[PDB]
Scaffold this active site. Sequence first.
Site, PDB file in Angstrom:
ATOM      1  N   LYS A  87       0.934  -1.297  -0.028  1.00 13.40           N
ATOM      2  CA  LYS A  87       0.043  -0.020  -0.190  1.00 13.40           C
ATOM      3  C   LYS A  87       0.928   1.143   0.052  1.00 13.40           C
ATOM      4  CE  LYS A  87      -3.712   0.292   0.142  1.00 13.40           C
ATOM      5  NZ  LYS A  87      -4.712   0.647  -1.077  1.00 13.40           N
ATOM      6  N   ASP A  96      -6.261   4.011  -6.235  1.00 16.06           N
ATOM      7  CA  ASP A  96      -6.851   4.185  -5.119  1.00 16.06           C
ATOM      8  C   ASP A  96      -7.717   5.485  -4.999  1.00 16.06           C
ATOM      9  OD1 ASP A  96      -6.527   3.700  -1.657  1.00 16.06           O
ATOM     10  OD2 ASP A  96      -7.194   1.923  -2.964  1.00 16.06           O
TER      11      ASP A  96
END
Length: 416
Positions: free
Chosen positions: A102, A142
Site C-alpha cells: 500500500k 486508489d
Amino acid sequence: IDPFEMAVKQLERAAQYMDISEEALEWLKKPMRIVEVSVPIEMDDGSVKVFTGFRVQHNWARGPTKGGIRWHPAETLSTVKALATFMTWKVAVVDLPYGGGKGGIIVNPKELSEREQERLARAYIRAVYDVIGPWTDIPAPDVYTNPKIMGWMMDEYETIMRRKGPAFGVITGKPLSIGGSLGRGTATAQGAIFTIREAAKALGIDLKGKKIAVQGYGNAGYYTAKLAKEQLGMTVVAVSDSRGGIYNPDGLDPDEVLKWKREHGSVKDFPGATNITNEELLELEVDVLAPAAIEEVITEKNADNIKAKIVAEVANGPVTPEADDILREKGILQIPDFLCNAGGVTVSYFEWVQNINGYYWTEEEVREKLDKKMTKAFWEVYNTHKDKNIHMRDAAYVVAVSRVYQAMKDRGWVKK
Ligand SMILES: NC(=O)C1=CN([C@@H]2O[C@H](COP(=O)(O)OP(=O)(O)OC[C@H]3O[C@@H](n4cnc5c(N)ncnc54)[C@H](OP(=O)(O)O)[C@@H]3O)[C@@H](O)[C@H]2O)C=CC1
C-alpha cells in the site's frame, strides 16, 4: 482508533481459530519494509513544495506485494500500514501469487492542477523507484487516484528503467492504450455476483425469480444490479443512493434507473416508486442483499431486523462484528467483506499477467478466469466456515493467514 492497531487486533483475533506459531504471528504483526520519502514538485507559481509519500510492503512470502496508492490530505502512515496488512490477506484469500502492499501521499488533489498532479505522480515514482518493480511491488489506483495517474507513473518508471524489462507490469489499472486490461470497470460486481451465485448454490435454492436490493448506485452497485438482472434471472426490487432510495416489487430496470439518476442527479423521485430511506430499505423482503455504497451500514441497532437469506458485502466492511454475530445465529449466510469484492484485485492480477506475458486477453477470457477464481475462493472459505463452526469472516481470515503462513514456512523464514 489507530488503523494499524485495529488490523493487528483482527489478526490476533483470527489467530485463535487456527494453529499458528507465535514467531510467525509476531512476523505478521509488523510490516517487512516501510519507506517514507519526500516528494518535491514545482508548483504552477514557481515554488517547490515538499510532499510526504508512503510505501509499505507488509509481506512478500507468496510473491510481489500488491496495493494501490491513495492521495488524501488526512492520510497517515498507520493507515497505509493497516491497508497493506489487509491487502496481504485480500490477495491471499483468492490464491494470488502476491504479497500485500500500500502507498500514499499526504496531499489535497483538489488544489492541484493537472500539470501539478503529473509532476507529483512522476516524483513519487522517482522517489520510491528502488522498492517497486514488476516482480517486487506493483502499485494500483486508489482514493483520489485514477488510470491517468497510473499512465503517468508507468511512463516515469519506464523512463527510469530504460525499457530493460516489462515496464507495463510495474503498475495496474492503467488505460487500455498502454497495457490496460479489459473487464477492469466491472471487476468487483462480476466477482460479487459469482460469489452470490455460489452462495445460492450452496444454500440449494433456485435463484431465478428472487428479489435483490442494492445499497448505492456507483460503479459497484449499478453493475451489481445490472449483472443480477443480466445472466442469472435475479429480479431487482430496490436500489438506493446517498440521497435516498426506491422500491417496487413489480420490478426495476437498472439502465432506466441509471439514466434517470444521471438526468436528475439522484434516484430520488423515480417514476413508479415510493421514496424509501436506506435504513428502511436495508430491512426489506429480499432474498439477496448486496450493500455496495458505504461502510458500517449494518450495526447493532439494526442487525436483528434484516430478513434476507444472503448478504453480499460488496462494500468495504458494511457489517459490524456484533452484527455479524447477530446475523450468523439467524441462519443468514454472509459473504465476507474482502472476499465479495476481490474481483478488482483479481483483475489487477490478470492485467499484471497480461503485461508481463506481453499478450492480452478478451472480455470473455477475463470473465471466465475470474469466474473460476471467485468460485474456488468462495468454496474454500465456505467449507472452512462449515468445518470449524466459525463465522465467514473468521474462515476467510483462517484461509488467507494459513496460506501466508505456509509460504513463510516453505521459504524458511519461520521454522515452527
Ligand atoms: N473497485 C471497486 O469498485 C470497489 C468497490 N468497493 C466499495 O464499493 C462502494 C461503491 O463505490 P464505487 O464502486 O467505487 O463507486 P461510487 O463511489 O461512485 O459509488 C458510491 C455509491 O454509493 C452511494 N452512497 C454514498 N453514500 C451513501 C449512503 N450514505 N447511503 C447509501 N448510498 C450511499 C452513492 O450515491 P450518490 O451517487 O447519491 O452519492 C453512489 O451511488 C464503495 O463503498 C467501495 O468501497 C469495494 C471494493 C473496491
